[PDB]
């Protein structure tokens, strides 16, 4: 078997500052190196990074400016990666993205190198195909965290001469074709259809109610989901007999609103249609939606890696987190970004409810029914993965 | 790492010159890890 | 445990005390039976199992134990003393060997397999204490696996299974439960001991459960030991063992003959069909060869191509066709055997002299001239010295035999007195066998000579005394 | 380990960029592996007679003919790197 | 470590060389 | 006849190789906010071995409840009338393992949030797989508590 | 010994009779073929910090 | 020794470059007699594509899946292409330690001339030097 020897464990202590610039000095370095380079690897962990900073005692984490930082810093290693940088930091100084060699050809210009041209080939080559008008087969778009994303093939930049690049409809690239593209607005104006991703689809999906892969079945209250079917039943409506049945998440809401507490279900239990029964819970739940969607995107996104992908897999539709395009996943970390610049700025209760880590204390700033209901939701996901575990040990 | 054998040629001749100078001599005493005199 | 405990603190006194490489054994012969008779243990298996590899981490020594990716590191008996007090045995893999490119490997693997299952057969009872199958990790069952059992089974040796490449499962259990049940459907025995171990002399700490083979090891090589007394550590170096009778030695080397020890390059075609794919290939050749439609039937079976019989491990026959002539060349080569007796006091008398006489000119004729100058004495003379001093060329020498059992087998010179010389005992009447078991004879010896064949050095023709030419 | 940088003994580059003897600067700060301890003459006589061969396969500090004077090279004056040149 | 980024192999000496013998 | 001593290194080993084969600023005290300053002056005033005992004993019922729950039975079953044991076993509950993510989870949220208002980070979430280590940390950080 | 007594196989055609004129290294540099063989902290950063 | 014959006669059957030439792995045209940079493969066949032998640059003579050598300069025609053995019988991509992106074959039919159609080609055409009619 596998058995560890010993681990390690480090307190958690804030570091303490006689003056201002040593303050200002670390903070800088320590909480920028590390979002730079989570955005630049895998910046859907920043909320993790956020999570662990603020219990190490990063106070000034969620606040206006650091997320501003972050979402620009996020777009620049899109930005980064789709140029062809490996490492985001030449020095612990200056960034990579920022290098202009002196006395030379250009003094303003960039420090290519020849991964960059070839990525830059790639890019023309994209571009051209787009004014023909054929269909512009980019390459990296089907590149993903692990690999490629349909072909099991192996490709590697900087090409040779021996086996390069070839295209079936002989669009033609070269580095004497790139050389004016040498600084970054004016590569931008040219290649920014294939460097920015696209968050429309997304501007909805972190503001909607969303369920852990809960169904009727997994329904905690089986007299609620019941009494749900019944009314569904009163109403001119045909019902599914099966547990697997597509339920609409603004309805599986209110269905887990009235599940938490039991006051409410009797109460709407002698209702005669679940119209009434969604119309009085209405003016509740509308106070209470926003605040356990926002506490379940934080708290789902802060703890564990497996549980980031779990959550983006599940909000966005995406059938593997693996085999998804990077372009797509980083328009879904902006999307989400944002989501948490809006919870942070707009609601005066968020910046509180974000350094919040306990439930003691996310109990004391949130209503104890959200609370409830918020609970009794990851509680029912959390008995779905507890009866898969049981049917494997059996 | 670098071995030494005979040659034949003038890089040997050179070597079987230069080798027999003697490198400069100093006695160095025993350190002191354990009992530190300078910490009393 | 009581005896637990004891055979613990046993094995780390003895194996704390150091080893050495004792003697390569190739020939039944030149055994460590003598001063040097310890208890052994034997390691036998496939090619490149782990072999020398769990006797080089369990002498705590890389170097000592060589071991190699190439198959075939490993030709011959290996005897390593433990403390000592215990014999661990290397044994050659019994396979093919592959990358190994050693000149007459015909004669050299036909030579290392003869002194492997010769030594396993007649010391089984003693000292011997136990024999541990080394077997891979995911290797599924070959019939080079097949031909050990059915050797085992039949010789009625008892056996340990080592599992080695213990990493390869990487913590499996499910994996490792698998692997121990297919063993146990090709033995057919639950009751079979089953020690998984991997052995890493490089490194100590990836080494898991080595430690307690060397426990294992020593409670096999104790279980002979009736005292206390005789379970400390002064007990256990004065057992010792005797010497094998002529009788049981001459049947285990007729029942297993040199020529029979001839394995396919491969490892998974059976020596049934081996034998199989001679004879077909052989038949093909005879009917094709028009040279071979010049000679009789009765020519065939002189020149053995058409054709007491050589028995194989499994039971198979083989004919004199399959046998190399370097393996014929070995046989009558190893000294102290009777084919190597037999080459030098005449295999066949009448049948010798008439192929020498047609051989040569003739039996009485002198200085004949068949149907320039000789050479001169000032040359022959020279060409004796050349010879003599500088080639190094010697004539043979006589075999010497016991007098007094050569004139009359069945006196009490020859031995095998049915008599009992001790009177007022009961238990020596019992007490009988082959090999026996002596206290004291790495200390006493049986006196006079005690050391076996080929482990003095100068001795014979090898003097140092009147050198080269002397003899 | 060694008082001098590990890029004098194998460069940073994937070429070998930086192999060689390198004398420095009596008040300079850095260090380079010009010694001449009775331990350190070894590997400075061959880096001066034998050169070195770099798995690439080229000789990175002296190919053949003249062997360089680790005596009279110009002092260090820094480091090498991927972006530039120096 | 996990990185998402266009594959991007290192200068080695064996590429070095595999490139002077193209 | 064993001379290690004077036969080389590729013929024997000493006794000697063979035994040595085997052988070879300031400090703050810094309270979590979580918990509140009667929760603090409790769970530092009670004791040290006390607070182990406390620890033990809640993520042993913890533990025990969620296994009841979801079925397999940790307790000791006799075969003579099929009885239940009296209570829950400390060395069972420190040889269990928690290699389960939910079930690690579950059981981290429930004491360590619970009666203990800590929060671990990510890397000492992945760590945090057995009670052994679930002790030592929640012990580090009452040790870190501690003035 | 093959061949010649004091030369052996190495036959006078095929190769030279003594490659070690003097002193040879028989170190090769980069022989281990990393990715970065400047040291462990040598130009840009690698990995996040801490 | 060699047992194979040398200047392979062609009265029987010529075999000549042709002037409309493409490639295998590329489809595109190549030199015909005035560089020997293709591989030139006959076999005496008319059979679709190429017919009396197709045609490879020495640098696409590689295979088409993978990007690699050949392992006994061999290589599998699949649908057009020509894949290497370890990628016809399905088996793993496994990169040569010699040279990657090209294979060990003469040029102009120079290392497929020992093997393939000599002198005579058919029995009936012995047997129409030795009749006088
Ligand atoms: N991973 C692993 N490799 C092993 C283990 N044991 C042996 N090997 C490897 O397998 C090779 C064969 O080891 P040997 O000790 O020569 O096996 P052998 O049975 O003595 O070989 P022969 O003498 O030819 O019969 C060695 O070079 C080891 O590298 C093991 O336990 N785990
Ligand atoms: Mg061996
Ligand atoms: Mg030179
Ligand atoms: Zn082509
Ligand atoms: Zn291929």
Same mark, same amino acid.
């Given at each position: 078997?596998?058995?560890?020897?010993?681990?390690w464990?480090?307190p958690?202590?804030?570091?303490?500052?006689?003056?201002?610039?040593?303050?200002?000095s670390?903070?800088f370095?320590?909480?920028?190196?590390?979002?730079?380079?989570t *955005?630049?690897?895998? =910046?859907?962990?920043?909320?993790?990074?956020?999570?662990?900073?603020?219990?190490?005692?990063? =106070?000034?984490?969620?606040?206006?400016e650091?997320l501003?930082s972050?979402?620009?810093?996020?777009?620049?290693?899109?930005?980064?990666?789709?140029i062809?940088?490996?490492?985001?930091?030449?020095?612990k100084?200056?960034?990579? *993205?920022?290098?202009?060699?002196?006395?030379?050809?250009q003094?303003?210009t960039?420090?290519?190198?020849?991964?960059?041209?070839?990525?830059?080939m790639?890019?023309?080559?994209?571009?051209?195909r787009?004014? @023909?008008?054929?269909?512009?087969?980019?390459?990296?778009? +089907?590149?993903?965290?692990?690999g490629?994303?349909?072909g099991?093939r192996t490709?590697?930049?900087?090409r040779?001469?021996?086996?390069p690049y070839?295209?079936?409809?002989g669009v033609?690239?070269?580095?004497?074709? !790139?050389?004016?593209?040498?600084?970054?607005?004016?590569?931008?104006?040219?290649?920014?259809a294939?460097?920015?991703?696209?968050?429309?689809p997304?501007?909805?999906?972190?503001?909607?109610?969303?369920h852990?892969?809960?169904?009727?079945?997994?329904?905690?209250?089986?007299?609620?989901?019941?009494?749900?079917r019944d009314?569904?039943?009163?109403?001119?409506?045909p019902?599914m007999?099966?547990?697997?049945?597509?339920?609409?998440? &603004?309805?599986?809401?209110? @269905?887990?609103?009235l599940?938490?507490?039991?006051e409410?279900?009797?109460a709407?239990?002698?209702?005669?249609?679940?119209?009434?029964?969604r119309? &009085?819970?209405?003016?509740?739940?509308?106070?209470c939606?926003e605040?356990?969607?926002?506490?379940?995107?934080?708290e789902?996104?802060?703890?564990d890696?497996?549980?980031?992908?779990?959550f983006?897999?599940?909000?966005?539709?995406?059938?593997d987190?693996?085999?998804?395009?990077?372009?797509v996943?980083?328009?879904?970390?902006?999307?989400?970004?944002?989501?948490?610049?809006?919870?942070?700025?707009?609601?005066?209760?968020?910046?509180?409810?974000?350094?919040? @880590?306990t439930?003691?204390? +996310?109990?004391?700033?949130?209503?104890? %029914? $959200?609370?409830?209901?918020?609970?009794? !939701?990851?509680?029912?996901?959390?008995?779905?993965?507890?009866?898969?575990?049981?049917?494997?040990?059996? | 790492?670098?071995?030494?054998?005979?040659?034949?040629?003038?890089?040997?001749?050179?070597?079987?010159?230069?080798?027999?100078?003697?490198?400069?001599?100093?006695?160095?005493?025993?350190?002191?890890?354990?009992?530190?005199?300078?910490?009393? | 445990?009581?005896?637990?405990?004891?055979?613990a603190?046993?094995? %780390?006194?003895?194996?704390?005390?150091?080893?050495?490489?004792?003697?390569?054994?190739?020939?039944?012969?030149?055994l460590?039976?003598?001063l040097?008779?310890?208890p052994?243990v034997?390691?036998?298996?496939?090619?490149?199992?782990?072999?020398?590899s769990?006797?080089?981490?369990?002498?705590?020594?890389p170097?000592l134990g060589?071991?190699?990716?190439?198959?075939?590191?490993?030709?011959?008996?290996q005897?390593?003393?433990?403390?000592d007090?215990?014999?661990?045995?290397?044994?050659?893999?019994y396979?093919?060997?592959?990358?190994?490119?050693?000149?007459?490997?015909?004669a050299?693997?036909?030579?290392?397999?003869?002194?492997?299952?010769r030594?396993l057969?007649?010391?089984?009872?003693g000292?011997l204490?136990?024999?541990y199958?080394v077997?891979?990790?995911?290797?599924?069952?070959?019939? +080079?696996?097949?031909?050990?059992?059915?050797?085992?089974?039949?010789e009625?040796?008892?056996?340990? !299974?080592?599992?080695?490449?213990?990493?390869?499962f990487?913590?499996?259990?499910?994996?490792?439960?698998?692997?121990?049940?297919?063993?146990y459907?090709?033995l057919?025995?639950?009751?079979?001991?089953?020690?998984?171990?991997?052995?890493?002399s490089?490194?100590?700490e990836?080494? !898991?459960?080595?430690?307690?083979?060397?426990?294992?090891?020593?409670?096999?090589?104790?279980?002979?030991?009736?005292?206390?007394?005789?379970?400390?550590?002064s007990?256990?170096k004065?057992?010792?063992?005797?010497?094998?009778?002529?009788?049981?030695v001459?049947?285990?080397?007729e029942?297993?003959?040199?020529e029979?020890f001839?394995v396919?390059? %491969?490892?998974?075609?059976?020596?049934?069909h081996?034998?199989?794919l001679?004879?077909e $290939?052989?038949?093909?050749?005879?009917?094709?060869?028009?040279?071979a439609?010049?000679?009789?039937?009765?020519?065939?079976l002189?020149?053995?191509?058409?054709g007491?019989?050589?028995?194989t491990?499994?039971?198979?026959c083989?004919?004199?066709?399959?046998?190399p002539?370097?393996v014929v060349?070995?046989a009558?080569?190893?000294?102290?055997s009777?084919?190597?007796?037999?080459?030098?006091?005449?295999?066949?008398?009448?049948?010798?002299?008439?192929t020498?006489?047609?051989?040569?000119?003739?039996?009485?004729?002198?200085?004949?001239?068949?149907?320039?100058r000789?050479?001169?004495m000032?040359?022959?003379?020279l %060409?004796?010295v050349?010879?003599?001093?500088?080639?190094?060329?010697?004539?043979?020498?006589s075999?010497?035999?016991?007098?007094?059992?050569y004139?009359?087998?069945?006196?009490?010179? $020859?031995?095998?007195?049915?008599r009992? $010389?001790?009177?007022?005992?009961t238990?020596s009447?019992?007490?009988?066998?082959?090999?026996?078991?002596?206290?004291?004879?790495?200390?006493?010896?049986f006196?006079?000579?005690s050391?076996? *064949?080929?482990?003095?050095?100068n001795?014979?023709?090898?003097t140092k005394?009147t050198?080269?030419?002397?003899? | 380990?060694?008082?001098?940088?590990?890029?004098?003994?194998?460069?940073?580059?994937?070429?070998?960029?930086?192999?060689?003897?390198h004398?420095?600067?009596?008040?300079?700060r850095?260090?380079?592996?010009?010694k001449?301890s009775?331990?350190?003459?070894?590997?400075?006589?061959?880096?001066?007679?034998?050169?070195?061969?770099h798995?690439?396969?080229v000789?990175?500090?002296?190919?053949?003919?003249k062997?360089?004077?680790?005596?009279?090279?110009?002092?260090?004056?820094?480091?090498?790197?991927?972006?530039?040149?120096? | 470590?996990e990185?998402?980024h @266009?594959?991007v192999?290192p200068?080695?000496?064996?590429?070095?060389?595999?490139?002077?013998?193209? | 006849?064993?001379?290690?001593?004077?036969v080389?290194?590729?013929?024997?080993?000493?006794?000697?190789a063979?035994?040595w084969?085997?052988?070879?600023?300031?400090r703050?005290?810094?309270?979590?906010?979580?918990?509140?300053?009667?929760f603090?002056?409790?769970?530092?005033?009670?004791?040290?071995?006390?607070? +182990?005992?406390?620890?033990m004993?809640?993520?042993?019922?913890?533990?025990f409840?969620?296994?009841?729950? /979801?079925?397999?039975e940790?307790?000791?079953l006799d075969?003579?009338?099929?009885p239940?044991?009296?209570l829950?076993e400390?060395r069972?509950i420190?040889?269990?393992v928690?290699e389960?993510?939910?079930?690690?989870?579950?059981?981290?949220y429930?004491?360590?949030?619970?009666?203990?208002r800590?929060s671990?980070?990510?890397?000492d979430?992945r760590?945090?797989?057995?009670?052994?280590?679930?002790?030592?940390?929640?012990?580090?950080?009452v040790?870190?508590?501690?003035? | 010994?093959?061949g010649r007594?004091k030369?052996?196989?190495?036959?006078?055609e095929?190769?030279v009779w003594? /490659?070690v004129?003097?002193?040879?290294?028989?170190?090769?540099?980069?022989?281990?073929?990393? =990715?970065?063989?400047?040291?462990?902290?040598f130009?840009?950063?690698?990995?996040?910090?801490? | 020794?060699?047992?194979?014959?040398?200047?392979?006669?062609?009265?029987?059957?010529?075999?000549?470059?042709?002037?409309?030439?493409?490639?295998?792995?590329?489809?595109?045209?190549?030199?015909?007699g005035?560089?020997?940079?293709?591989?030139?493969?006959?076999?005496?066949n008319?059979?679709?594509?190429?017919?009396?032998?197709?045609f490879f640059?020495?640098?696409?003579?590689?295979?088409?899946?993978?990007?690699?050598?050949?392992?006994?300069?061999?290589?599998?025609?699949?649908?057009?292409?020509?894949?290497?053995?370890?990628?016809?019988?399905g088996?793993?991509?496994?990169v040569?330690?010699?040279?990657?992106?090209?294979?060990?074959?003469?040029?102009?039919?120079?290392?497929?001339?020992?093997?393939?159609?000599?002198?005579?080609?058919?029995?009936?055409?012995?047997?129409?030097?030795f009749?006088?009619?």
């Amino acid at each position: 078997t596998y058995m560890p020897q010993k681990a390690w464990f480090e307190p958690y202590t804030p570091k303490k500052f006689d003056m201002e610039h040593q303050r200002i000095s670390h903070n800088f370095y320590n909480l920028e190196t590390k979002l730079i380079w989570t *955005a630049f690897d895998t =910046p859907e962990l920043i909320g993790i990074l956020l999570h662990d900073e603020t219990i190490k005692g990063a =106070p000034h984490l969620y606040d206006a400016e650091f997320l501003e930082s972050a979402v620009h810093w996020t777009r620049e290693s899109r930005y980064w990666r789709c140029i062809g940088i490996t490492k985001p930091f030449y020095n612990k100084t200056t960034l990579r *993205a920022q290098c202009w060699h002196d006395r030379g050809l250009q003094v303003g210009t960039l420090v290519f190198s020849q991964a960059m041209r070839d990525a830059l080939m790639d890019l023309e080559r994209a571009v051209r195909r787009k004014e @023909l008008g054929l269909e512009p087969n980019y390459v990296w778009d +089907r590149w993903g965290p692990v690999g490629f994303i349909d072909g099991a093939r192996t490709d590697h930049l900087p090409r040779f001469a021996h086996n390069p690049y070839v295209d079936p409809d002989g669009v033609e690239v070269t580095e004497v074709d !790139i050389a004016p593209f040498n600084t970054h607005e004016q590569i931008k104006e040219r290649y920014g259809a294939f460097i920015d991703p696209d968050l429309r689809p997304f501007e909805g999906v972190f503001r909607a109610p969303s369920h852990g892969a809960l169904t009727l079945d997994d329904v905690p209250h089986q007299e609620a989901v019941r009494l749900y079917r019944d009314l569904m039943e009163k109403a001119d409506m045909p019902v599914m007999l099966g547990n697997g049945a597509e339920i609409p998440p &603004m309805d599986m809401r209110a @269905l887990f609103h009235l599940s938490a507490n039991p006051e409410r279900m009797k109460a709407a239990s002698e209702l005669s249609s679940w119209r009434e029964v969604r119309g &009085m819970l209405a003016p509740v739940q509308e106070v209470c939606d926003e605040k356990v969607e926002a506490l379940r995107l934080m708290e789902n996104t802060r703890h564990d890696a497996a549980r980031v992908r779990t959550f983006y897999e599940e909000k966005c539709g995406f059938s593997d987190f693996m085999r998804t395009p990077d372009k797509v996943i980083t328009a879904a970390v902006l999307c989400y970004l944002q989501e948490l610049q809006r919870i942070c700025t707009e609601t005066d209760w968020g910046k509180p409810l974000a350094r919040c @880590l306990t439930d003691l204390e +996310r109990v004391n700033v949130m209503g104890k %029914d $959200a609370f409830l209901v918020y609970r009794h !939701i990851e509680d029912a996901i959390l008995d779905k993965k507890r009866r898969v575990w049981a049917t494997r040990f059996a | 790492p670098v071995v030494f054998k005979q040659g034949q040629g003038m890089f040997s001749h050179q070597l079987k010159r230069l080798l027999q100078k003697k490198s400069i001599h100093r006695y160095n005493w025993d350190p002191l890890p354990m009992y530190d005199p300078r910490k009393l | 445990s009581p005896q637990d405990e004891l055979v613990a603190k046993l094995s %780390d006194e003895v194996f704390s005390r150091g080893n050495m490489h004792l003697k390569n054994v190739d020939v039944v012969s030149a055994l460590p039976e003598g001063l040097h008779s310890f208890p052994e243990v034997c390691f036998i298996g496939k090619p490149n199992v782990g072999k020398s590899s769990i006797i080089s981490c369990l002498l705590r020594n890389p170097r000592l134990g060589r071991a190699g990716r190439v198959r075939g590191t490993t030709r011959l008996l290996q005897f390593f003393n433990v403390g000592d007090a215990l014999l661990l045995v290397d044994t050659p893999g019994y396979g093919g060997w592959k990358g190994r490119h050693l000149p007459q490997s015909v004669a050299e693997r036909a030579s290392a397999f003869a002194i492997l299952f010769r030594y396993l057969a007649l010391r089984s009872k003693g000292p011997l204490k136990r024999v541990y199958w080394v077997m891979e990790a995911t290797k599924p069952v070959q019939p +080079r696996d097949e031909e050990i059992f059915v050797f085992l089974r039949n010789e009625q040796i008892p056996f340990s !299974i080592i599992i080695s490449k213990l990493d390869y499962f990487g913590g499996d259990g499910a994996a490792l439960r698998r692997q121990v049940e297919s063993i146990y459907n090709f033995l057919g025995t639950e009751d079979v001991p089953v020690l998984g171990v991997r052995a890493d002399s490089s490194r100590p700490e990836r080494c !898991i459960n080595m430690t307690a083979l060397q426990h294992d090891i020593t409670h096999y090589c104790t279980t002979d030991l009736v005292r206390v007394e005789d379970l400390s550590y002064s007990g256990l170096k004065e057992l010792s063992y005797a010497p094998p009778t002529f009788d049981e030695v001459r049947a285990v080397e007729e029942r297993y003959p040199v020529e029979s020890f001839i394995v396919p390059q %491969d490892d998974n075609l059976s020596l049934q069909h081996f034998v199989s794919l001679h004879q077909e $290939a052989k038949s093909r050749h005879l009917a094709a060869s028009p040279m071979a439609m010049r000679l009789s039937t009765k020519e065939k079976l002189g020149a053995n191509l058409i054709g007491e019989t050589i028995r194989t491990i499994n039971g198979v026959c083989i004919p004199k066709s399959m046998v190399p002539p370097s393996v014929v060349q070995l046989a009558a080569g190893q000294a102290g055997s009777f084919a190597a007796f037999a080459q030098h006091s005449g295999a066949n008398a009448y049948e010798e002299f008439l192929t020498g006489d047609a051989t040569g000119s003739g039996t009485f004729l002198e200085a004949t001239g068949s149907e320039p100058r000789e050479k001169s004495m000032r040359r022959c003379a020279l %060409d004796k010295v050349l010879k003599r001093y500088v080639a190094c060329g010697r004539k043979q020498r006589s075999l010497h035999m016991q007098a007094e059992g050569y004139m009359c087998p069945w006196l009490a010179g $020859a031995g095998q007195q049915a008599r009992s $010389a001790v009177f007022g005992v009961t238990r020596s009447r019992a007490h009988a066998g082959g090999m026996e078991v002596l206290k004291g004879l790495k200390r006493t010896g049986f006196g006079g000579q005690s050391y076996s *064949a080929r482990t003095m050095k100068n001795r014979g023709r090898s003097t140092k005394k009147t050198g080269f030419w002397a003899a | 380990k060694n008082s001098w940088p590990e890029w004098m003994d194998n460069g940073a580059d994937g070429t070998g960029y930086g192999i060689g003897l390198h004398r420095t600067h009596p008040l300079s700060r850095l260090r380079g592996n010009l010694k001449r301890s009775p331990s350190h003459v070894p590997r400075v006589l061959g880096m001066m007679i034998q050169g070195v061969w770099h798995k690439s396969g080229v000789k990175l500090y002296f190919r053949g003919g003249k062997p360089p004077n680790p005596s009279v090279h110009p002092y260090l004056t820094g480091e090498p790197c991927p972006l530039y040149g120096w | 470590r996990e990185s998402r980024h @266009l594959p991007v192999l290192p200068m080695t000496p064996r590429i070095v060389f595999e490139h002077a013998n193209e | 006849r064993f001379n290690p001593e004077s036969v080389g290194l590729t013929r024997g080993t000493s006794a000697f190789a063979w035994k040595w084969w085997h052988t070879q600023q300031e400090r703050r005290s810094h309270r979590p906010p979580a918990w509140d300053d009667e929760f603090a002056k409790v769970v530092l005033n009670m004791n040290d071995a006390e607070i +182990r005992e406390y620890l033990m004993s809640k993520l042993t019922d913890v533990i025990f409840l969620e296994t009841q729950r /979801d079925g397999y039975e940790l307790r000791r079953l006799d075969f003579e009338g099929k009885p239940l044991t009296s209570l829950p076993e400390p060395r069972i509950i420190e040889n269990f393992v928690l290699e389960e993510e939910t079930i690690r989870e579950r059981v981290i949220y429930q004491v360590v949030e619970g009666v203990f208002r800590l929060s671990p980070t990510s890397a000492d979430r992945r760590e945090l797989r057995s009670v052994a280590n679930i002790i030592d940390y929640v012990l580090t950080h009452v040790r870190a508590a501690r003035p | 010994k093959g061949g010649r007594a004091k030369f052996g196989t190495r036959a006078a055609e095929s190769g030279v009779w003594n /490659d070690v004129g003097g002193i040879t290294s028989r170190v090769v540099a980069n022989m281990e073929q990393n =990715p970065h063989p400047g040291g462990d902290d040598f130009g840009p950063p690698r990995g996040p910090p801490k | 020794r060699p047992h194979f014959p040398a200047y392979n006669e062609d009265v029987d059957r010529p075999m000549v470059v042709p002037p409309d030439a493409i490639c295998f792995n590329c489809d595109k045209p190549i030199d015909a007699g005035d560089v020997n940079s293709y591989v030139w493969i006959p076999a005496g066949n008319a059979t679709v594509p190429t017919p009396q032998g197709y045609f490879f640059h020495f640098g696409c003579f590689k295979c088409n899946r993978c990007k690699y050598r050949l392992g006994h300069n061999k290589f599998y025609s699949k649908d057009g292409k020509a894949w290497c053995i370890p990628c016809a019988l399905g088996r793993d991509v496994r990169v040569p330690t010699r040279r990657w992106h090209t294979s060990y074959v003469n040029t102009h039919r120079t290392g497929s001339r020992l093997t393939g159609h000599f002198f005579p080609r058919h029995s009936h055409q012995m047997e129409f030097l030795f009749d006088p009619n």
